[PDB]
Structures are given as C-alpha cells and as structure tokens.
Design a protein around this ligand. Structure first.
Ligand SMILES: [Mg+2]
Ligand SMILES: [Mg+2]
Ligand SMILES: [Mg+2]
Ligand SMILES: [Mg+2]
Ligand SMILES: [Mg+2]
Ligand SMILES: [Mg+2]
Ligand SMILES: [Mg+2]
Ligand SMILES: [Mg+2]
Lengths: 423, 423, 423, 423
C-alpha cells in the first residue's frame, strides 16, 4: 500500500558546496524514495524561508536544524497518511508548520518530504514520475532554454543582464535540440577563447567574459550560432533574464550601464533589443514592485515577446491573481522551492494556465543530482524548461533525464518546438 | 504488467432501448475492465461516425457490425500494446481506421476500446480512474447542472429552448448541492402537478409540460426554486441549452415562436432573458454555421454570461482553434463520443483550457450504467458537469459516483461552486 | 538468479557537454542497473581507446558507434553469463574484442557493460556496491584530495603545475573532513577577491587565477587554510599534480617558468617545494618516458613524500611491474577507464598493493552523475580519493555517496586520516 | 534479511578425540549455518586462550562452560545485529569479553559465532563463502604445502625439524598439483616400507619414522619425489617447519643433535640446507623471542627464501607492526583461532600484505570436518595453504573443498604455481 512508514533526513552538499537537506521516505513494502532540496541565491520578501543553522559551522549555512525537524516532528506527523493523497499530506505539513512562509519548520524540510512522498507514490503506482504527476496525456518534451552567457550579478562585468539564453525552437526532435544547444555552446566557447576572453564557467555553466555591453553580448551569441551551422531565429532563438531588481534602487530608477532611466526608457531599450535580435522571451524586465511600469511594458511590447515573471511572482497564487488582474507578465516561472510544496506548485501552475500565461519550470543556482524538475516539466506539459547550459552535470542530469523520458515515450512523444513562441 | 491480452465485445441496450457496444479488456495480470459506449440523438456531421447495421433488425440500429469489427480487427491490433501508453494505443486505432471521422470502423467501437483500456490502466496503477486521468491534483468536484425542464426538440410544445437547467452554485459542499438539486426537482414536480400539467419524464429525466413560452418556463423554475427554500441567484442559478440549429433554416433565419428574426434580435431576446433572470450560462445560442452572428453575440453579451459551444465545436481541436482565433464561445462542451478516443478528448480540453475557455463534461441522450464521465469531470478539473436531472438512474449513477469520489477524497475535496461562474 | 537477460545502451552528455555511453543491463529477476562511462580531457599512448564517431555531428565526438556495438555484438555476447563471475564476463569481452587496446569495440562500451553488470551483481545479492566489491572488511573511508586551484594546461597562465590539492588529514571523521574541505574552498573563493582575481570555475571545480608562479599559488592556498580556521600540515596538508608531460619536449628538457631544466633541476625544485610547504603527495613529477629521471627522483625524495604515477602507468599491470622493478612511483593512480574493465582494475590495484605502493581512486575530466568510484575507493580500501573540489555536483555526488556509505557503516567506519601519509 | 535470530552451541569431538565447540547461528529467513572451532596441539603467550573446563571429565579438556557462555551471554548479545556487518558483530563480541586476549569468554566460544555468522552472511547473499570474504576478484587457487614427514616434537626421533613439506609449484592446474602431492605421499610410504621403517601417521597424516638427522629426511623426500615420476625443484619444491622455539632453552641455546649453538650457527645450518636442497620456505627458523637473530637471518637469507614466523607473530597486528618495522621474516601464518575473530584475521592479513609479506592460511593440530580455511585461503588470495598431508580426512576435506571451488570457478580459476615463490 502507499502508506508512509519511515521518514529520514541527512545533510549533504549541493552543487555549490553549501549544505542542504536530503529526505528518504520508505513505504511499508520496501518502496524507498529519496529527494534533495535545491537552494536559491536570493531569499526575496515572499518566498518560503530556508531554516539555516547560523553560526560558524559551514559558514553559518548548516541545515542540521531542518534535519532534526524532519527526524523528530515531520516524520511522525506524516507517518501513516496515504501517499497518493498529495493534497492531504501537503495540507498536513502546511498546518503543522502554521505560518504563511513555513519559516518555523523551513521550506526546505517540508519540500523535501513533499517531493520524496510524490516520488514514492509514483514508484508505488509503478508509473514513471512524469506519467503520475501528469496523467495519461503527458507527452510533450520542453524546449530547453540554455543559459550560455552569464552577466550581471554573477561576475564583474559591464553588462547587467543576468542570463543570456538560446532556445532551439526549430529542431525536429528533442535530441536534435539538445545537440544544437551543445554545438552552440562549444562554438561560443571557441569564439570567446579566440578574442582572449575568459572561459571560466560561472554557477550556471554559462561563460562570464568581460564584454562591452548587452548588444555586444547578443552579437557574440549570434556569431556563435552562425558558426555552429544554424540560422538565428529560424533554428535558434535568443532569450534574456534581466533581473532588474538586482540593479534597481527604489525611488531613483534603474541604473543601467551608468545611465539612470525610468521604466519608459528601459522599455525603449527592450524594444530596440527585440527589433535588432530574434528575442522570444525576457524574464523579469523590471523590478517586482514597479507594477505600473510592468503594466506599461506589457501593453507596449507584451504581444511581440513573452514576459516571464520570476520575482514579481514567487510561484505564489495570491500574487499571481493580482498580476493576472492588472494585465502584466504573460508568463510564469515555476520554481518548486519558492512555494514549499508540490501541491501549491501544481495549483499555481494551473492558475497561470487558465489565465493565458505560459509557464516555465526552472532551476535554482544550487542544484543537486536530483532530476525531478525534468519529470515535472514533462508532466505539467509546460513546453519550456530552463535548467542551465549543457555543462556542470547538475544541469546536464536534467537533459539526460529528458532524453530517457523521450526514449520511454517513444512514438508518443512530441517536441514543443516553435509551438511555445507564437510571437 | 499493463499489456493488453484480450478484447471482447457484445451488444447491449442503452437507456433508450437502442443497441450499443460493450467492450471488455482483460490484462495479463487479471485486470478486467468493461466500458459501454453512449450514443446521442443529434449528429452534428463533423463528429465521428457511429457504425450501425441498418435493415429491419432493431429498427436498423443494430451494432453487430461494430461488435464484429472489435472481435476481428481491433482485438489483435491492440493486443500487446502498453496500457499506460494511451497515446500509443489511440494513435494505433486512429491509423488502423484511416479516415478523418473513423467511419470505417465506427467511432463507437474505437471509443469503447479506448475507454476500456483507460479503465484497465487506472485499475492496474491501483489508482482510481479520476486520480489516474487527472494526476495527483485531481480534487475539484463539479457544479452539477441539472436539466429539470425539457422543451424544444423533445416534446410538442410552444417552447423552443431545449433544456432548462439549474445550478446550485451556493452550496457549501457537493452533497448539499445534490440535495438542493433534488429538492428543486421535487418542488417543480409539485408545482407542475398543481397546474394540471404533464409530469412525464423525457429522455433526460426533465419534465415536458405545455407551458406558454421561455419566460413562463423560467418563471415556473423560479417558483420551484422559491418553494424549495432557497434564493434564486445566491443559492441556485439558471442555465439554458438553446440548440438553435433545431429551428434555424439556413439563409432565412431563426424561426422563434413563429417570428423570423436575425442574429441581432436573438441577441436582444437573450439579453432580456439575462436581465430578468439569474442566468449564468447559455449553450449553443445560435446555429453552428452563423459564425458572424456568434462573434457578434460573444462581443455583445459574452462577458455577462458563459457561452457554451455544443455544436459549433464538436470536441474537435481543428474547429476549436478556429473558434478560438475569431473570439467566439468562451466555453467548450466535452462529449467523449463526438471525437472517438480519450486522447483527442484530453487534447481538445487542454487546447480549450489554455485559451480562456471553461469546459463542461456532458452526457448523451442515450447513456448506460457507465459512470466514466464523472471520473473524467473530476480528473480534468472542469468544475462543471451536465448529466441530467436527479432521476432515471442512468443520470443518477453519475451523481452517485461523484458522491463516492468526494467520500474517497475526504478533506482534500473542494466544491467548485461560485468559482465556476464569475460573471 | 544473476544471469544477464538484456543489455541496451544509449547516448547521453557528460559533465563537459560531450556525448558518452550509458548501459542498462537487466537481469532475469528484475534487477535493473545503469552505468555511464566517463572520459578524460587528454589520453596517452597505452590506455584503451574510445570509439568516437568522427565527422560533423557533435564536433566529431559522437558515440553512436559504441552504442550500436553494444546493441548488436556485446549484447548477445554476454546474455546468459553469470553476473557474479566477474572474471568470466570481462574475459569474454576482452576476447570478443581481440586487441590489446580494445580498439575494435572501444574501451567505453566494454567498461560500461563491465560496470553495469558489477552494479547488478551487487544489487542482486542485495549487498551495497562497496561491500560486494570489497567483501566484509570494507570499512575505510578515504581522505578526499580536493582540487581547489587549477593551473598549467587549463588556464594558460604563468603557472605550470596542473592541480593544487588540499587533504584534510587531521579530521576526526569523514564528515568533518568534507566540512574542512568545503570551508577551505569558500575561504579561497574570498581570498581571490581580496587579491583582485577571478572566480571562474574550471573543469574540476577548481579556480583559475592569474597568479605569478607556483610558490605564489601554494602561499595563496596556505593563506586560505589559515583563514578557514585550521593549521596547515597538522589539520590540512597539500598536494600537487605536476603533469610533467604537458611541458616536456622529448630530446630536450622540461620547460618550466620559461627556463629549460633537466630532471635534476626539477627534482631540486620539488625539494624546495617540499621544504617550505606541507606537501604529502606529488603526482607525475616527471614525464612518462624519462624512466631514469624517475628512478633518480624516487631515490632522492621518495622517502619524504608520496610519488603518484598517473601517466607513467596507465593502470596497466604490464607497465606497473616494470615500474615496480626500477624503483619508481611508490604510489599508483587508479582510473577505471584507462584499462577498460573492472577486473583489470582490481588486478592492477592488487599488484600495486603487494608491492608497497599506495593507490588512489581517481576521476576523469568528463564525469557523469555516476558515483561508482566512491564505492570502489571504499571497497578496495585505498584510503585516498581524488574527485575534485566540492562544487560542480558531478564532483560532489561522489562525496555525497561517501557520506551515505559512512552513515550505512555506522560505528564500523574508520576515517583513514594521517594513516595514509606517514612521511 | 541478514539479522541473527537464534544462536545455539554444543560440544563435539575434534580430529584428536578432544572436545570442542560447535555453534549454529540461524537467521530469520531460515539460513542455518554451523561452524566448529579448531584447537592446536600447543598454545603460546600471546594468542587468545581457550576456555577449558578443567577437572576429571574428558581429561580436564571439557568445553561444557564455553558452550554455556554462548547459550546464556553471547546469544542475546548478538541476536538482532546485522550479519553482513562483520565489523559490528565482532567488535560487539570483543567488547562483551573485555580482555586483551578474550579470556573471560574464551577464544573458542567467540570464534565459533564469528565464523557461523560469516557462513550466513555468505549463505544469505547466495554467494559461496569464498566469493563473499574475497569479493569478485577471488580466483586464485593456492599451492598446497603437504606435510608428508613429521619429526621433532611429534615423535621420539633424532629429527629436530617439526614438519617437512612438499609443494607442487610446477603443476599446470590445482587438480594436477593435488595428484602430484598424493603420488609423492604414496611413493614415500613405499620407500619407508621398503627401507624397514614405520608408517604410523602423526597428527597431520605425515609419517613418523625413526631416522637420524635432518639431511637424511630431506634425502628420503627427494628419493620419494624421484620415484613418483617428477623432478625436484622444477616440479616439486621442499619446505620446512623448524619450530625452533620447541627446543630453545632461553639463555642457553639451541641444543640439538648434540651441539649447543647460537643464532649465528643456525643461519649457517639453514644456508647449507638451502644450498643442498630446493627449499622455498622455512617456518619459525629461530625462536619466539630471539628478535636480533631473526633480523640477522632475514638480512642474510631473507631474499633467497621465504621466512614464515607463525609464533613470533600470533596473527596479532600489534606484534606484526613491530616485526614489520624491524623487518624480521618475509611471511606469516594466518591461523584463525590464534586471534579469536574473523575481522581481526582479515585486518592482520591486510596489514601484512601491504608490508611485502606473503601469507599462508594454516591449520591446527586438532581440526574438524569444517572446511572454512579453504574458502578463506582462496578468498584472501594468499596463494599458499598448509593443511596437512593427503590423508586423515580432516585434512583431505580441505583439498576436496578446494577442488569444488576450482570446479565452481570454471575458466576463471588460476593456479598460483611458481608465482608464490619467486626466490
Ligand atoms: Mg533569483
Ligand atoms: Mg531570474
Ligand atoms: Mg446534440
Ligand atoms: Mg446541446
Ligand atoms: Mg590525462
Ligand atoms: Mg594527472
Ligand atoms: Mg604450537
Ligand atoms: Mg608451526
């Protein structure tokens, strides 16, 4: 039966060398699932809170407190519930915590137990995780948005756009899309090494060279796409993650490239970018509190390009409805550890689907060898995924799992190429 | 394993005394599921073709040919595939037929095998059918739209609105919604018996009295709602199924109550109805070819009420996209036997979800003791269902199955009342 | 029964974005294993060769040919053998190939099948992989040598030594050793900023600074160790990977720091290093063909430091015996894919144990999410491991698996700290 | 599961008619393994002591109270541990005893439980007892060293060496080595009968003739090897067990053959023997405490012959490290009941492997029908075994078990002939 019997937790290291929680759920017969909780560089004001130790051990980032919370409190609080009742167990956890941010028990411990329970339920049904979480109709493979060139808050560089991403929208299958992405990645590596720029990978596997500006970066990416043998826009498109909050001082304006601008001038810069390049999506173009500027930008360019809300929404339904009503950000970015449980994740992605918003399962800066977000991007049928460059196998494990998913589907699979970017 | 071993078929009677197909799929384990194929009265032409015998036996409606087709072709054509690969088996069937409307093998045989395969896959996973088809997040119980008063193409009467439906949107749970529906039904029965009107149930369990007109019918329904002890609009709302095609002569106009009117005057009549009554939804307000009039009506009153497309769309994605682009009919009506397979059903309901359209799992005129559309309306989370009045247990089996579903969910369940009719 | 039933391979991406092989050997019971084959940055003249595709697809590095080889020949050539007869299957493969380098079938396909059948002959007995491969006495956790600072043939800067490593030899347990390593890593990450340098991770997770020379690098590392809160030598030692072949022009001397030197001069440089720093191990100090210089260096400084043979031996027993005879390289470096199969690895490590040589299970430049070298370094009881810096979770997966191994052992485990570097 | 459930013990007779202990560890599954504890003719000053009854029953050698120690203390003290954790259970026993030589509970009541659990941690995994203890690479069949001619402390004779042994190093396989040993044995039996001597078997199956001097014994053995059809040195070597502690009066000297001699004289006697005969190994050449003479003898001839201590080390790691650092003897005998547990045995054999010492699993004077030392000599890959002459089926059971092992290996097996005696 799918009734929880044991809940264990241990402390491991994530892809960046910081501690994190690993939860192992054992069912009565022997079904034994294991899930590790990813982490993020920016805490925010609305996400769930990670319960860190604090002090001098591990630089104050130990998670012995969350491990102890799982081993003494959450364990018996879920031992005995029904695995296939995700909403039951997740409401149990959310009430056992009792706070609107889950900070008393930490979002990481709760998410670890939630995810391991979902994995054990999918293992029990003998379905594969994507089939369970998505049902019978889970057949779509997502377009990998590969962040190949890093800037902004990741390195000392003039550019302040965080992530520059390519998207192989013109590929016939998913495996060919992965091949094109890897080829563009190596072509860009060669192009960089040619101009005496640094080829030291950041935290996302993307490069961090000292480029002149955003336009020079996009032109370098276009050169790399051309050198691979493809056609920009018809085969490979471009995408941005601006993260304007990382350079927005409240009440003065967005200091961009040494020139203070209003929301209007940022929208003009974005319009120029969209004109001169085959951009298909921009993520967090303005700050997460400048709602009026966001509505202005959605009116201006919000039908020639996809507008992804990464920080303005925190995968919270309560902020998602408020952004739906005011006509902003016709796209969501689903990070599973910004909400704390799988159930609220599915609810927010449903709420964003029924509002005309595309979604995009995304990764964190500190990931692990867990490849669940691939299964989750296939199950919910998002048709987009953002899980880094084809390097640093914490990022490549996701692509490998998507390859295995496509092979397991077989003739049923469909690649969501160019059907995810109509504009 | 979920690999198909045997496929049988027999000929049974539906709720109206006409033959239909019953398919029994037996898996290797011992999982043995059966499913019967419903059949409606009105064929919208675009929908899949129902392969009948023709002749003198059973009035020319025998289905011995579909039974033979299942026993000689489809059986070995699916024996050996993987049950959980719904899209695999359904594409196998659709190619084995080879026609754009499945007329060579009939939509009924193909749908019977599809549904029995889905039932055996859900039984294999040991999940319940709604949990399988909907995943982990299948928790919403739909608002039952109970057709209590029949007119139009169902009896000799001055009214030409086909179905008059009530909807308990104000109930706290699903059980109380069913109770309120049954109480309104019996109150209306008493109100009818008082005025010496006929209490002979039609094909939907609804009554067929010789009332003056649409307004008199709605006033009688409001009297019945008041006599039950509830408040019209706050507790119970009203709904219409016009089926205008049943009185639309092409090139002349909608002959309503002996007066030929254009689309404009029909929209004015509908606006008057919406004003004087708490109508929340109208289904097929105009013909299925008067696209311009439909766009006009969607612009005029298509934000004060729900516009359900029953015939203008036939659960076909190719017509659904075309109706999406032209701004028409912000609601779909999902009939499983108008498309022929479960897979295309799920695809059309997905396509209508991501377009701002609410859906509504619906029944046919000739049903059976099969309660699959209840599980299907819970799984896809439509939040609405149309399965007749609480009588004629081919209609009540669905409500009973929804009660069992709610009991099995428990604390996780949520009634979709007042969240499915914002206007 | 542990008899092989199926063997199937697919093509995936490794940690560097290049293709590689992944084999999945199922057993007649249900045991289903999976092992991906690593590949290094640079190979030599004596190891087994990888069967790459060549051409334009994937930059000429596709492995579709090795996948096809597994699926047509290696598959049926082992289906039916006994899993626990590791010495049977590996000789079967080695004869089926027929060449001294496994060129006909590629070392990668052979190694994939070897490792996967080993992971199934350990999963069958329900033992854990380390307990199987090592027996009942497998209880020692190795000292992690963490490559934190990269140089030489990687960042093309003024440094020539390839890998600078730290080794927490003074820790009480393994988990504290991992903590100390991570803390030294994060301290160096800040010392770099405090000396105006870059924090771009290389291929091993180590940093790529533009520091003056070798001595400056060791001084920077010592500063980071002091800033972490530990004591150099008593808590944390140091290590080197000279990789002399990358700067040795045959017929002339080693070109170091811009000067041509003889073997004697390099030995004096290494002695000056051993002087002012707590170096415990140097790897490949001279080229893999300068045997006489190797004997000289072994007799000179082979009593005060460990001498690791990385290229002078390729995990080949036939070269290992010769290096044993002439008195060189008191330590071996075990890379599993430089010999092509598990059995030859076990034989070479046995041969190096019975000769007074310490061993060190090592990683390749392109790894995957496979964590077999952790189990293998616990099983053979090497007491040392070299698997990169605590970053880039293709490196951190090994440390996480070693943590799980220590937790599973419990009181039995012993950390081999300060018992692996007597000199 | 490998969790101990029941532990029993009874008192049986060994090969010499003295009582001994027989333990029967049972597992929860049904795994039921028994193991009898051997006992030597004479103990020393550092082994673990046997807990004899003392008194008049069985000549004071009863073990009725070591049988009781297992049924009242050790039983519940191990019932519940994990079989595959040899380190765990063996440390549990060693602490439950609490003495430096296991005297409180006897070194026979503990070793029985150790062995009978290991015979269930191998029976459970369905591996054979030799694959478990040695892993997957256990393939080497040892060179049988057959003691065919007894002298010294065994019979009233002018011979001073204890055991004269032959070793078929030139055989192609193990079965041919056993055949050659048996043929030499019968040839010697015929030569003895033909030269007017006695054929009374000692405690090892070897003969006890009344011959004069060592040289005459080696000449008899060489004549038997010649008469068998072989040639000394190329086919069959020779070996000695001086056991010189049995005639070393401390402070006076090695009185033998009517000459009191110092350690220096014995080295010349051994050198003369080594010259005139093809000796490959001498066991206990000088004494249990004459360390300086041992170092001298190791310097003198310790690279032209193997030096076995057996008594100078007692399979105790503590004395082994001292003998390593002083580098006295090139080899040791691994007697499992001189250390008390299986774990400490493996630890000492590992410690002596990594020091340049070859090992030799050996038997005791009083053995049983237990054939564990064969499985243990092939698992640790010692390449040598000393288990008596091919007679007295307590000694032949070991050879029969090695034959079964060689048959079960198949093509994987390798005979360690002439690779175990390079000198
Ligand atoms: Mg962020
Ligand atoms: Mg972002
Ligand atoms: Mg109809
Ligand atoms: Mg209708
Ligand atoms: Mg190399
Ligand atoms: Mg190296
Ligand atoms: Mg003795
Ligand atoms: Mg002896």
């Amino acid at each position: 039966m799918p009734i929880i019997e044991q809940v264990r937790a241990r402390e491991i290291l994530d892809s960046r060398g910081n501690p994190t929680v690993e939860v192992e759920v054992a069912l009565i017969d022997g079904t034994f699932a294991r899930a590790a909780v990813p982490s993020g560089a920016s805490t925010g004001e609305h996400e769930a809170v990670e319960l860190r130790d604090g002090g001098d051990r591990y630089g104050g980032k130990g998670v012995q407190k969350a491990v102890q919370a799982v081993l003494d409190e959450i364990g018996p609080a879920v031992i005995g519930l029904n695995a296939d009742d995700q909403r039951l167990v997740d409401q149990a956890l959310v009430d056992l915590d009792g706070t609107p941010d889950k900070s008393r028990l930490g979002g990481n411990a709760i998410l670890g137990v939630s995810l391991a329970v979902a994995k054990a339920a999918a293992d029990s049904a003998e379905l594969p995780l994507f089939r369970y979480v998505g049902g019978p109709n889970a057949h779509i493979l997502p377009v990998p948005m590969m962040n190949i060139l890093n800037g902004g808050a990741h390195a000392d560089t003039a550019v302040d756009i965080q992530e520059f991403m390519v998207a192989p929208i013109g590929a016939p299958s998913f495996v060919e899309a992965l091949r094109w992405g890897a080829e563009v990645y190596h072509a860009l590596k060669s192009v960089l090494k040619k101009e005496g720029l640094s080829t030291g990978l950041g935290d996302e596997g993307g490069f961090a060279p000292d480029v002149a500006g955003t336009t020079a970066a996009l032109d370098l990416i276009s050169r790399a796409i051309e050198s691979a043998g493809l056609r920009p826009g018809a085969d490979v498109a471009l995408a941005l993650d601006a993260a304007a909050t990382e350079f927005f001082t409240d009440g003065t304006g967005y200091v961009f490239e040494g020139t203070t601008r209003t929301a209007d001038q940022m929208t003009e810069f974005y319009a120029g970018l969209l004109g001169a390049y085959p951009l298909v999506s921009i993520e967090d173009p303005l700050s997460e509190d400048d709602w009026d500027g966001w509505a202005a930008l959605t009116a201006s360019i919000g039908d020639r390009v996809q507008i992804v809300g990464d920080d303005i929404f925190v995968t919270n339904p309560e902020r998602l409805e408020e952004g739906i009503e005011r006509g902003v950000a016709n796209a969501l970015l689903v990070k599973v550890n910004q909400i704390g449980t799988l159930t609220e994740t599915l609810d927010a992605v449903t709420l964003a689907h029924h509002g005309g918003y595309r979604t995009m399962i995304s990764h964190r800066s500190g990931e692990t060898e867990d490849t669940m977000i691939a299964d989750l991007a296939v199950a919910i049928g998002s048709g987009q995924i953002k899980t880094g460059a084809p390097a640093r196998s914490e990022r490549v494990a996701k692509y490998n799992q998507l390859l295995r998913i496509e092979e397991a589907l077989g003739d049923a699979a469909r690649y969501a190429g160019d059907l995810a970017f109509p504009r």
